[PDB]
Amino acid sequence: ELCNPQDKQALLQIKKDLGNPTTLSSWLPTTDCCNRTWLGVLCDTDTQTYRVNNLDLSGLNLPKPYPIPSSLANLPYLNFLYIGGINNLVGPIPPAIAKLTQLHYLYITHTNVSGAIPDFLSQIKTLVTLDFSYNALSGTLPPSISSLPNLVGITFDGNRISGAIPDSYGSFSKLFTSMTISRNRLTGKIPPTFANLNLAFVDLSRNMLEGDASVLFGSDKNTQKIHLAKNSLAFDLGKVGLSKNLNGLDLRNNRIYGTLPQGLTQLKFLHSLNVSFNNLCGEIPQGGNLQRFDVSAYANNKCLCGSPLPACT
């Protein structure tokens, strides 16, 4: 049998540790774990270790709450680990995951996992993406993950994370291009060190952030989406530079002031725009895609005017 004996026992232990759910009844001692019949399990054919390097646990419908099994640490060749959509998965992200030294892609999402996002993840130098969204995570954001050299993005949306965004999150490498931490409880300001990032995507919507978000803008940046809705931000929007790549700009429900920047008429790919429920004033820039957006995208500001709104005096 091709299945490695130690991977085999860890997988059967994981199964037992989750109450031997019927959703894992394909994990049979009588069949080879490497031959694609064990649901969600694959072995590394590419590097020819033939060790289990890809595990997907999804929608298992556990019969009662169980934590993330510490037997996951006994699959040391994991590169890809997805754990998601499991209502009855509870407890913290165990330091047992630190044993997965070759992880590239890690998702623990749409579960009831709780506690803080662990600071130990910074030691897993192969990490390319982290997704811990839609769980019950609390605590503050772990500052040390900014040292990860291959990390391209973090997806931490929809938890209960509190505290300020660490200044060290402006220190990610040039490969880091996507940061979403929406629907949490962050407070404070966006760190000035974020001028060092070049984000394709940034979503910090539905938090309690305050102050200036100008650092996330710039005509030298390569940014496709900027989503900052539902915070308490306040800065002069008319002063910001805009990435030519911008396709989505959502700043609704903040305390942003000044005029809309004339540079918006030059964005060829702007397809979604919402600046409602702010303190903006002045003529809406006429040109580009600006007059294609409904009135509701600009309404409820202080004194905006010009098409699609009534004429300026």
The domains found in the chain, sorted by start residue, are 1-313 (3.80.10.10)
* Interatomic CA distance for residues 309 and 55, integer angstroms: 53
Closest CA to 20 of 69, 55, 54: 69
Q: How far is CA 274 from CA 70, 225, 242, 247, 293, in A?
A: 45, 12, 15, 12, 9
Q: Determine the residue type at 194.
A: F
* Interatomic CA distance for residues 293 and 309, integer angstroms: 11
281, 261 Cβ separation under 8 angstroms: no
Name the method of structure determination: X-ray
Phi, psi of 145 (to 5 degrees): -70, -10
**Two tokens, residue 290:** 């600006």
Query: Resolution for this model in angstroms, one decimal place?
Result: 1.7
Q: How far is CA 192 from CA 168, 171, 177, 227, in A?
A: 10, 11, 17, 18
- Count CB-CB contacts under 10 A for residue 280: 23
Q: Determine the residue type at 121.
A: L
* Interatomic CA distance for residues 174 and 216, integer angstroms: 15
* Interatomic CA distance for residues 225 and 45, integer angstroms: 37
Q: How far is CA 61 from CA 22, 66, 85, 89, 213, in A?
A: 9, 11, 9, 9, 42
Closest CA to 201 of 232, 255, 160, 155: 155
Q: In sequence order, what are the residues at sequence separation of 6 or more whose Cβ sits closer than 8 angstroms to the Cβ of residue 16?
A: none
